Amino acid sequence: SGFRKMAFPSGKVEGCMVQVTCGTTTLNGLWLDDVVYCPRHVICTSEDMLNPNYEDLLIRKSNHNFLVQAGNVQLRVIGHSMQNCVLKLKVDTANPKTPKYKFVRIQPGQTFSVLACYNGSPSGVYQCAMRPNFTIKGSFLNGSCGSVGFNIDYDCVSFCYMHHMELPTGVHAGTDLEGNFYGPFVDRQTAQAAGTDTTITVNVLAWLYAAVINGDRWFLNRFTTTLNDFNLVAMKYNYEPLTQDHVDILGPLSAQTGIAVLDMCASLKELLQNGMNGRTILGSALLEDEFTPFDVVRQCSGVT
Amino acid sequence: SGFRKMAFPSGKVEGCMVQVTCGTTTLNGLWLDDVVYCPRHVICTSEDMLNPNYEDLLIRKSNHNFLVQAGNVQLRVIGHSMQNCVLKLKVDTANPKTPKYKFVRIQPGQTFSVLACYNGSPSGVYQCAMRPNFTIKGSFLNGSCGSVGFNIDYDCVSFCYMHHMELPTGVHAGTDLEGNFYGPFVDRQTAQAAGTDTTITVNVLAWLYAAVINGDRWFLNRFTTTLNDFNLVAMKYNYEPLTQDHVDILGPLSAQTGIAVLDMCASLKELLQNGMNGRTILGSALLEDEFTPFDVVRQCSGVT
Ligand SMILES: *CC(=O)Nc1cccc(C(=O)N2CCSCC2)c1
Ligand SMILES: *CC(=O)Nc1cccc(C(=O)N2CCSCC2)c1
């Protein structure tokens, strides 16, 4: 029993983190096989970042200008290229700790673990969600970019995020490992405002199911609703619209608890309309939305 | 910027987890040097757990009755002993992945990372605190006991917790790695009620400092208080008494923010008396108490 905001064990990713230095800029890189992936803004001075021309800046850079250090050992860079907003540094040594891995581009509402790193050294691990506005709410100080987000399926690490920037509102933007930003953000020190940070409804419902499984039941009510009725209330409260696809995804939790998805929607509707009245659910005073239905099943069933 | 409930990177501990089987009971063990540590209730049937005599049960057990499996390779058990509520299984092979480590007995209010494991396989990592009632609020299913809690100082893992039991209220009890339970709990399936789960005041204040550092400032007020005045309010709200030792520990955060500890106490007092009025602090609707002052400095300064 109990339900925690749980990250994947980070060891497989720890074994991939390196330091990348270009001139006076140092950040983190991801070493998989004989390639090191890092944000392309490693080539920028803070001055460059106001309006960088990355292709032009890269012309001034040779293989020997990219210093890659794995622990306290230097890797030899034998090639470099820019793919979207990442650099790929070819090194002469395959990472001996390379796990089975994939690159995945996640959808908003999907959760992942971040291994926060500084100078290629792991500092901490925490669980994030891709927000509906394609930001994440992370914990990233100076030196953290190139820190990665990932999911693990048994022995395969799916990398989904590399950290690039902090918006002036202190929320975070980054890329997949093909170097494509999530959302409309660019690797430039300019005006970039996030859109509405809406609540991930399907995740809230998953977490209400988790609450019921773990004995938090006070919010279960006598009501049901319809997708369209629920969605009117969702709209009012800046919750994402619930689709039949979301209902289908919650089916296993519905089955386990015997609470129809639309009944849990009606419970959520009343919580939105009535508030918590100073009560808590799984130790939270707000409705948690950074657990996916898959997360709730995993943690409630004990997958490794 | 940003502030997250962050665990230590778990790789060093992942390399220590093994499966221990005695008859039909399987749980987790910690392999350091040539010793495997595990809960002594590995020798019990669920029936035994009603009123176990561990010394008597252990007489029926030989080295060859303890099956220890590290990945898919079996370790040879050449010795076993009971120390308090843990078994120490001597194996013929030193764990080649043994990190620098210590065993520490933590005090209530101290935080640590848990690597939740099943059959010696890591499932997840999360951050906990030793509650003032010597419970932890974990996420532990059947098969999770022998999962460990730890802090990391650079390259040294300090192990502070091994999971043993779930109280009927779904909170968790366990031992240090010398096998001594935190608090009054025993490894028996009997009536064990937890005491008052009081709020760790010094940790709340640390987290208010973290909030100010990260731009959440709405709760800063025009007031100050005294330790004795604050403590009257703390008592009313089931908060731990604040001592001058706690004030001294918050000095660096006081210095960084320029907010006197007693001024932040006065802010906390008003939050206790007035509530949040539907506002949030660092994405929480309640006052978070599972960050230590050391945690806030670490995460706000980016230690690896
Ligand atoms: C991605 C990231 O962290 N960018 C960055 C921005 C400014 C400065 C640096 C940098 O090189 N350092 C090393 C010295 S201490 C500050 C971080 C990186
Ligand atoms: C420490 C712990 O998890 N204890 C425990 C209690 C009951 C049963 C087991 C056990 O052996 N298994 C393996 C089969 S599936 C249930 C967990 C362990």
XYZ file of C-alpha atoms and ligand atoms in Angstrom:
644
model
C 0.000 0.000 0.000
C 0.925 3.683 -0.348
C 1.316 5.692 -3.561
C 4.375 7.879 -4.279
C 5.587 10.099 -7.111
C 8.101 7.450 -8.243
C 10.932 7.813 -10.814
C 12.480 4.939 -12.741
C 15.708 3.627 -11.221
C 18.344 5.880 -12.855
C 21.457 3.622 -12.982
C 21.142 2.763 -16.714
C 21.047 6.503 -17.528
C 23.744 7.448 -14.974
C 26.085 5.205 -17.039
C 25.449 7.425 -20.114
C 26.062 10.930 -18.695
C 29.181 12.828 -19.798
C 30.402 16.426 -19.623
C 30.620 18.424 -22.886
C 32.698 21.643 -22.996
C 32.921 23.946 -26.056
C 35.152 26.962 -25.248
C 33.829 28.230 -21.894
C 30.334 26.588 -22.118
C 29.994 23.294 -20.125
C 26.832 21.194 -19.994
C 25.729 17.547 -20.038
C 25.809 14.996 -22.851
C 24.264 11.596 -23.362
C 26.751 8.905 -24.520
C 25.054 5.964 -26.360
C 27.119 3.626 -28.540
C 29.844 5.885 -30.062
C 27.680 9.067 -30.154
C 27.375 11.847 -27.565
C 24.146 13.869 -27.804
C 24.038 17.397 -26.321
C 22.194 20.711 -26.808
C 23.610 22.639 -29.808
C 23.710 25.806 -27.616
C 26.928 24.264 -26.144
C 28.643 26.270 -28.963
C 27.108 29.620 -27.755
C 28.414 32.379 -25.458
C 25.478 33.807 -23.329
C 25.849 36.759 -25.815
C 25.392 34.388 -28.840
C 22.083 33.170 -27.211
C 20.303 36.541 -27.890
C 20.123 35.751 -31.674
C 22.326 32.699 -32.473
C 22.931 31.497 -36.068
C 23.855 27.892 -35.193
C 25.075 26.865 -38.678
C 27.376 29.947 -38.786
C 28.620 29.391 -35.187
C 29.276 25.695 -35.952
C 31.600 26.565 -38.931
C 34.109 27.952 -36.314
C 34.054 24.568 -34.446
C 36.233 21.496 -35.087
C 36.034 17.997 -33.495
C 38.943 19.002 -31.160
C 36.888 22.024 -29.901
C 34.318 19.617 -28.279
C 35.785 18.366 -24.962
C 33.932 15.203 -23.844
C 34.782 13.750 -20.411
C 33.208 10.502 -19.057
C 34.056 10.379 -15.364
C 37.663 11.663 -15.356
C 38.602 10.115 -18.801
C 38.545 12.177 -22.043
C 36.731 10.799 -25.136
C 38.238 11.434 -28.593
C 35.760 13.247 -30.865
C 36.146 11.963 -34.460
C 33.017 13.631 -35.932
C 30.244 16.129 -35.186
C 26.933 17.089 -36.786
C 23.864 19.140 -35.924
C 20.464 17.407 -36.033
C 17.735 20.010 -35.339
C 18.637 21.473 -31.877
C 21.116 18.710 -30.788
C 24.719 18.016 -31.639
C 25.809 14.457 -32.248
C 29.485 14.046 -31.345
C 30.985 10.873 -32.797
C 33.612 9.475 -30.384
C 36.149 6.647 -31.015
C 34.800 4.557 -28.063
C 31.376 2.913 -27.749
C 29.940 3.554 -24.262
C 30.523 0.155 -22.581
C 27.494 0.900 -20.297
C 25.113 1.620 -23.242
C 21.734 0.092 -22.220
C 19.115 -1.149 -24.690
C 17.522 2.149 -25.743
C 15.077 3.916 -28.039
C 14.380 7.569 -28.837
C 10.658 8.362 -28.389
C 8.765 11.608 -28.861
C 6.146 11.604 -26.085
C 2.691 13.251 -26.205
C 1.500 15.891 -23.711
C 0.238 14.228 -20.508
C 2.938 11.512 -20.670
C 5.236 11.214 -17.622
C 8.966 10.474 -17.520
C 11.884 10.494 -15.093
C 14.552 13.262 -15.259
C 18.136 12.631 -14.127
C 19.258 16.171 -13.202
C 23.048 16.436 -13.933
C 25.811 19.084 -13.564
C 29.230 18.680 -15.310
C 28.115 15.173 -16.450
C 27.501 14.123 -12.767
C 24.060 12.969 -11.581
C 22.561 15.123 -8.775
C 19.011 13.711 -8.509
C 16.077 11.958 -10.105
C 12.411 13.055 -10.200
C 9.214 12.368 -12.146
C 7.840 14.982 -14.641
C 4.978 15.184 -17.138
C 4.996 16.783 -20.576
C 2.454 19.590 -19.808
C -0.366 20.208 -22.380
C 1.483 23.493 -23.254
C 4.687 21.401 -24.034
C 6.590 22.735 -21.027
C 7.747 20.678 -18.060
C 7.947 21.865 -14.461
C 11.468 20.659 -13.606
C 14.295 21.459 -11.209
C 17.183 22.775 -13.367
C 20.003 25.168 -12.292
C 22.785 26.573 -14.551
C 24.831 23.617 -15.953
C 21.774 21.253 -16.032
C 21.050 21.466 -19.788
C 21.613 18.183 -21.622
C 20.072 16.420 -18.599
C 17.628 13.805 -20.058
C 14.092 12.468 -19.504
C 13.344 8.781 -19.958
C 11.003 5.840 -19.373
C 12.222 2.265 -18.739
C 10.382 -0.852 -20.065
C 12.211 -3.735 -18.155
C 15.748 -3.314 -19.664
C 15.056 -0.782 -22.502
C 15.511 2.974 -21.779
C 13.227 5.123 -24.000
C 14.772 8.616 -23.986
C 12.085 11.284 -24.594
C 13.577 14.585 -23.362
C 16.778 16.597 -23.288
C 16.780 19.821 -21.229
C 17.558 23.052 -23.162
C 16.068 26.168 -21.525
C 14.184 27.904 -18.727
C 11.416 30.346 -19.815
C 11.261 33.639 -17.862
C 8.269 32.111 -15.904
C 10.733 29.432 -14.541
C 9.151 26.520 -16.495
C 11.266 24.338 -18.773
C 11.524 23.545 -22.479
C 13.543 20.968 -24.341
C 13.752 18.551 -27.212
C 13.356 14.888 -27.980
C 16.694 13.100 -28.717
C 16.240 13.991 -32.466
C 16.656 17.618 -31.295
C 13.047 18.716 -32.038
C 11.640 20.996 -29.319
C 8.456 19.997 -27.608
C 5.953 22.745 -28.432
C 6.808 26.051 -30.149
C 9.991 26.865 -28.165
C 13.366 27.788 -29.711
C 16.940 27.720 -28.297
C 17.145 31.517 -28.215
C 17.181 33.949 -25.223
C 14.021 35.789 -26.373
C 10.332 36.402 -25.381
C 8.766 32.928 -25.149
C 5.530 32.711 -23.144
C 3.881 29.323 -22.370
C 0.190 28.740 -23.188
C -2.485 27.592 -20.706
C -1.138 24.942 -18.341
C -4.293 22.789 -18.386
C -4.775 19.823 -16.053
C -4.248 16.315 -17.555
C -7.742 14.941 -16.802
C -7.046 11.255 -17.666
C -4.071 11.390 -15.229
C -6.173 12.936 -12.426
C -8.723 10.073 -12.912
C -5.889 7.469 -12.822
C -4.669 9.031 -9.533
C -8.277 8.958 -8.123
C -8.318 5.225 -8.974
C -4.891 4.874 -7.215
C -6.427 6.670 -4.182
C -9.370 4.210 -4.078
C -6.920 1.223 -4.434
C -4.897 2.617 -1.434
C -8.016 3.249 0.768
C -8.595 7.017 0.182
C -12.338 6.854 -0.716
C -14.034 9.901 0.943
C -14.541 11.705 -2.457
C -16.539 8.774 -4.012
C -20.114 10.096 -4.431
C -23.543 8.781 -5.538
C -23.384 10.435 -9.018
C -22.461 9.602 -12.590
C -22.112 11.858 -15.637
C -21.537 11.629 -19.418
C -18.374 12.536 -21.349
C -20.149 15.667 -22.748
C -21.475 16.802 -19.292
C -18.078 16.153 -17.640
C -16.315 18.008 -20.526
C -18.445 21.171 -19.913
C -17.092 21.194 -16.318
C -13.530 20.264 -17.505
C -13.573 23.295 -19.890
C -14.648 25.657 -17.025
C -11.737 24.385 -14.825
C -8.957 24.376 -17.568
C -8.961 20.514 -17.587
C -8.143 18.723 -20.873
C -11.231 17.290 -22.639
C -11.769 13.579 -21.804
C -12.110 11.348 -24.908
C -13.357 7.788 -25.312
C -9.665 6.859 -25.886
C -8.977 8.122 -22.294
C -11.980 6.096 -20.963
C -10.632 2.971 -22.786
C -7.152 3.546 -21.235
C -8.741 3.683 -17.698
C -10.650 0.365 -18.313
C -8.210 -1.831 -16.309
C -8.402 0.507 -13.244
C -12.209 0.606 -13.654
C -12.194 -3.226 -13.688
C -9.885 -3.612 -10.652
C -11.879 -1.114 -8.488
C -15.372 -1.806 -9.918
C -15.896 1.981 -10.322
C -17.192 2.901 -13.795
C -15.010 5.556 -15.436
C -18.024 7.916 -15.769
C -18.773 7.501 -12.026
C -15.164 8.538 -11.214
C -15.676 11.476 -13.649
C -18.758 12.475 -11.569
C -16.609 12.278 -8.395
C -13.961 14.481 -10.092
C -16.710 16.914 -11.252
C -17.903 17.353 -7.625
C -14.288 17.832 -6.403
C -13.814 20.559 -9.073
C -17.123 22.268 -8.094
C -16.883 21.776 -4.271
C -13.069 21.785 -3.750
C -11.304 19.533 -1.201
C -12.892 21.333 1.839
C -9.443 21.017 3.549
C -9.250 17.245 3.044
C -6.367 15.427 1.286
C -6.156 12.556 -1.246
C -2.993 10.415 -1.168
C -1.358 13.185 0.935
C -2.244 15.904 -1.630
C -4.516 18.971 -1.187
C -4.790 19.343 -4.983
C -5.741 16.895 -7.749
C -2.445 15.301 -8.954
C -2.110 14.941 -12.747
C 1.524 13.639 -13.211
C 0.552 9.941 -12.953
C -0.580 8.203 -16.183
C -3.021 5.283 -16.073
C 0.061 3.124 -17.016
C 1.972 4.609 -14.020
C -0.912 3.754 -11.603
C -1.105 0.143 -12.858
C 2.719 -0.220 -12.748
C 3.060 1.131 -9.203
C -0.129 -0.659 -7.965
C 1.106 -4.036 -9.551
C 4.897 -3.690 -8.737
C 6.524 -3.986 -12.243
C 10.411 -4.040 -12.385
C 14.796 27.362 -11.139
C 12.025 24.974 -10.063
C 11.936 22.753 -6.969
C 11.074 19.026 -7.118
C 10.798 16.148 -4.655
C 14.134 14.695 -5.830
C 15.662 11.276 -4.978
C 19.363 10.468 -5.121
C 20.444 8.759 -8.340
C 19.872 5.058 -7.520
C 22.522 3.275 -9.666
C 24.973 2.636 -6.776
C 22.157 0.937 -4.815
C 20.707 -0.883 -7.861
C 24.106 -2.666 -8.060
C 23.553 -4.051 -4.515
C 20.021 -5.508 -4.782
C 19.600 -9.300 -4.744
C 16.715 -11.730 -4.263
C 16.622 -13.816 -1.049
C 14.379 -16.919 -0.874
C 13.931 -19.065 2.274
C 11.454 -21.908 1.564
C 8.485 -20.166 -0.098
C 9.243 -16.604 1.206
C 11.020 -14.318 -1.354
C 12.068 -10.736 -0.651
C 14.959 -8.342 -1.313
C 18.495 -8.326 0.075
C 21.303 -5.813 0.087
C 24.681 -7.235 -1.068
C 27.703 -5.223 0.250
C 31.179 -6.771 0.245
C 30.569 -10.512 0.933
C 27.439 -9.983 3.112
C 23.768 -9.974 2.091
C 21.469 -8.120 4.511
C 17.732 -8.952 4.543
C 14.749 -8.881 6.934
C 14.847 -11.870 9.337
C 11.122 -12.495 8.575
C 12.420 -14.119 5.323
C 12.429 -17.334 7.462
C 8.670 -16.972 8.341
C 5.500 -18.424 6.779
C 2.636 -15.785 6.938
C 1.392 -18.125 9.768
C 4.762 -17.796 11.644
C 4.311 -13.941 11.498
C 1.384 -14.011 14.033
C 3.831 -14.811 16.924
C 7.283 -15.725 15.493
C 10.157 -16.963 17.715
C 13.006 -16.003 15.352
C 15.809 -17.798 17.250
C 13.730 -21.035 17.271
C 12.746 -20.662 13.569
C 16.400 -19.988 12.635
C 17.583 -23.318 14.230
C 15.687 -25.135 11.372
C 17.662 -23.097 8.747
C 21.050 -23.929 7.191
C 23.225 -21.816 4.821
C 21.874 -23.914 1.871
C 18.258 -22.959 2.848
C 18.981 -19.256 1.955
C 18.771 -18.887 -1.858
C 20.533 -15.659 -2.940
C 20.308 -14.645 -6.619
C 22.088 -11.542 -8.055
C 20.606 -10.974 -11.498
C 20.281 -14.560 -12.800
C 23.449 -15.893 -10.975
C 23.234 -17.763 -7.625
C 25.500 -16.702 -4.711
C 26.937 -19.402 -2.415
C 25.951 -18.786 1.224
C 28.849 -19.804 3.524
C 27.463 -18.306 6.776
C 24.385 -16.701 8.337
C 23.625 -14.806 11.543
C 20.810 -12.730 13.002
C 21.610 -9.173 14.137
C 18.476 -7.666 15.755
C 15.766 -7.861 13.006
C 18.128 -8.492 10.008
C 19.898 -11.566 8.740
C 23.453 -11.265 7.516
C 24.157 -13.926 4.886
C 27.875 -14.413 4.279
C 28.472 -15.276 0.595
C 31.725 -16.508 -1.057
C 31.803 -13.526 -3.508
C 32.319 -9.843 -2.675
C 29.796 -7.708 -4.600
C 32.010 -6.270 -7.384
C 29.633 -3.225 -7.537
C 29.921 -2.476 -3.767
C 30.010 1.360 -3.491
C 31.688 3.260 -0.649
C 29.043 2.933 2.075
C 28.115 3.532 5.701
C 25.237 2.386 7.909
C 23.551 5.387 9.594
C 20.608 5.531 11.973
C 18.721 8.695 10.974
C 16.637 10.933 13.279
C 12.941 11.721 12.712
C 12.553 14.541 10.159
C 15.520 13.283 8.086
C 14.806 12.469 4.413
C 16.186 9.626 2.297
C 15.632 7.948 -1.063
C 13.926 4.506 -1.276
C 14.688 2.089 -4.122
C 11.471 0.017 -4.220
C 12.407 -3.562 -5.354
C 10.567 -6.857 -6.087
C 12.479 -10.191 -6.443
C 15.772 -8.212 -6.162
C 14.772 -6.029 -9.209
C 14.450 -2.236 -8.910
C 10.951 -0.886 -9.745
C 11.266 2.794 -8.735
C 12.895 5.463 -6.625
C 11.222 8.110 -4.424
C 12.054 10.456 -1.545
C 10.729 9.735 2.014
C 11.140 11.252 5.478
C 11.429 9.438 8.795
C 8.126 10.729 10.332
C 8.228 12.017 13.975
C 6.245 8.826 14.903
C 9.086 6.679 13.299
C 6.917 5.531 10.396
C 7.496 6.371 6.744
C 4.805 6.931 4.128
C 6.176 4.706 1.343
C 4.953 2.782 -1.686
C 5.484 -0.932 -0.876
C 3.535 -3.936 -2.294
C 4.016 -7.630 -1.322
C 7.642 -8.651 -2.158
C 9.038 -5.122 -1.423
C 10.500 -5.854 2.042
C 14.295 -5.625 2.157
C 14.018 -2.589 -0.149
C 16.420 0.056 1.326
C 16.536 3.792 2.122
C 19.732 5.762 1.610
C 21.455 9.136 1.268
C 24.456 9.752 -1.031
C 27.351 12.129 -0.120
C 29.283 12.375 -3.513
C 30.405 8.687 -3.842
C 29.459 7.303 -0.357
C 26.012 5.644 0.100
C 24.757 5.977 3.716
C 22.108 3.259 4.138
C 19.551 4.268 6.814
C 16.470 2.082 6.208
C 15.408 -1.430 5.291
C 11.676 -2.038 4.702
C 10.018 -4.652 6.983
C 6.262 -4.089 7.415
C 3.041 -2.245 6.630
C 0.890 -1.237 9.658
C -2.881 -1.776 9.254
C -3.158 2.044 8.585
C -1.003 1.483 5.400
C 2.074 3.348 6.765
C 5.475 1.661 6.867
C 7.980 0.516 9.484
C 11.497 -0.789 9.162
C 14.975 -0.958 10.579
C 18.377 0.597 10.161
C 20.966 -1.772 8.561
C 21.905 -3.003 12.118
C 18.345 -4.426 12.187
C 16.994 -2.044 14.887
C 13.450 -0.852 14.120
C 12.799 2.836 13.922
C 10.319 3.583 16.711
C 8.509 0.947 18.805
C 7.547 -1.425 15.944
C 8.224 -5.190 15.893
C 8.370 -7.731 13.012
C 5.141 -9.408 14.121
C 1.646 -9.414 12.494
C -0.046 -7.851 15.558
C -1.833 -4.624 16.725
C 0.679 -1.812 16.120
C -0.789 1.703 15.971
C 1.372 4.732 14.995
C 1.470 7.835 17.230
C 0.686 11.409 16.112
C 2.098 12.124 12.658
C 3.277 15.662 13.483
C 4.582 18.051 10.825
C 8.401 18.511 10.613
C 8.462 22.292 11.214
C 12.163 22.895 10.344
C 11.518 21.126 6.988
C 8.411 23.234 6.240
C 10.534 26.395 6.894
C 13.316 25.062 4.589
C 10.672 24.498 1.862
C 9.287 28.072 2.421
C 12.864 29.326 1.878
C 13.054 27.140 -1.308
C 9.743 28.743 -2.430
C 11.158 32.275 -1.931
C 14.397 31.273 -3.818
C 12.206 29.996 -6.752
C 9.946 33.136 -6.833
C 6.894 31.914 -4.815
C 6.662 34.866 -2.349
C 2.911 35.639 -1.859
C 2.894 34.202 1.747
C 5.706 36.562 2.980
C 4.016 38.932 5.476
C 4.932 42.010 7.574
C 5.224 40.040 10.876
C 7.841 38.390 13.053
C 7.454 36.161 16.114
C 9.582 34.494 18.829
C 10.412 30.787 19.185
C 8.035 30.567 22.222
C 5.131 32.399 20.434
C 5.619 30.323 17.250
C 5.799 27.106 19.370
C 2.356 27.850 20.954
C 0.906 27.897 17.398
C 3.028 24.840 16.344
C 1.580 22.855 19.316
C -2.033 23.780 18.300
C -1.380 22.552 14.695
C 0.537 19.268 15.585
C 3.833 20.821 14.306
C 7.106 19.743 15.978
C 8.511 22.357 18.408
C 11.156 24.591 16.742
C 14.468 24.737 18.674
C 17.426 27.097 18.403
C 19.282 24.136 16.789
C 16.633 24.247 13.970
C 17.079 28.067 13.649
C 20.900 27.567 13.433
C 20.414 24.893 10.701
C 18.263 27.378 8.639
C 20.974 30.134 8.937
C 22.407 29.614 5.406
C 18.907 29.865 3.797
C 18.204 32.928 5.986
C 21.486 34.448 4.720
C 20.855 33.657 1.022
C 17.265 35.076 1.060
C 17.792 37.847 3.660
C 14.649 36.633 5.510
C 15.251 36.199 9.256
C 14.243 32.720 10.434
C 11.748 34.224 12.940
C 10.149 36.286 10.124
C 9.650 33.068 8.085
C 8.205 31.502 11.291
C 5.699 34.422 11.416
C 4.807 33.738 7.746
C 4.311 30.026 8.594
C 2.206 30.997 11.668
C -0.160 33.054 9.445
C -0.379 30.193 6.884
C -1.322 27.794 9.738
C -3.953 30.251 11.103
C -5.314 31.529 7.721
C -4.754 28.453 5.476
C -3.680 28.714 1.807
C -7.007 30.362 0.705
C -6.819 28.126 -2.439
C -3.324 29.313 -3.388
C -0.318 26.999 -3.953
C 3.384 27.126 -2.965
C 5.847 25.322 -5.261
C 2.831 23.520 -6.819
C 1.555 22.318 -3.402
C -1.754 23.165 -1.644
C -0.313 21.974 1.691
C 2.893 22.842 3.569
C 5.533 20.273 2.432
C 7.727 18.859 5.228
C 9.835 16.134 3.428
C 12.652 18.538 2.442
C 15.436 19.117 5.020
C 17.348 22.409 5.119
C 20.297 20.338 3.684
C 18.007 19.119 0.837
C 16.960 22.730 -0.030
C 20.594 23.928 -0.132
C 21.670 20.856 -2.174
C 18.895 21.211 -4.759
C 19.143 25.063 -4.838
C 23.042 24.839 -5.277
C 23.170 21.746 -7.635
C 25.449 19.303 -5.670
C 26.395 15.967 -7.434
C 22.397 24.425 -20.440
C 22.975 25.308 -19.383
O 23.011 25.005 -18.205
N 23.432 26.435 -19.923
C 24.417 27.289 -19.401
C 24.108 28.640 -19.298
C 25.037 29.508 -18.771
C 26.269 29.040 -18.346
C 26.586 27.691 -18.447
C 27.914 27.175 -17.976
O 28.800 26.969 -18.804
N 28.079 26.936 -16.666
C 29.351 26.484 -16.092
C 29.884 27.489 -15.096
S 28.785 27.720 -13.690
C 27.318 28.112 -14.652
C 27.000 27.045 -15.676
C 25.646 26.801 -18.967
C 8.582 -8.411 2.919
C 7.448 -8.904 2.081
O 7.149 -8.417 1.006
N 6.844 -9.929 2.679
C 6.078 -10.936 2.071
C 4.812 -11.183 2.589
C 4.020 -12.147 2.008
C 4.479 -12.864 0.916
C 5.743 -12.624 0.393
C 6.241 -13.390 -0.798
O 7.002 -14.339 -0.620
N 5.853 -12.993 -2.020
C 6.235 -13.702 -3.247
C 5.017 -14.226 -3.972
S 3.912 -12.911 -4.509
C 3.724 -12.143 -2.894
C 5.055 -11.786 -2.270
C 6.548 -11.640 0.967
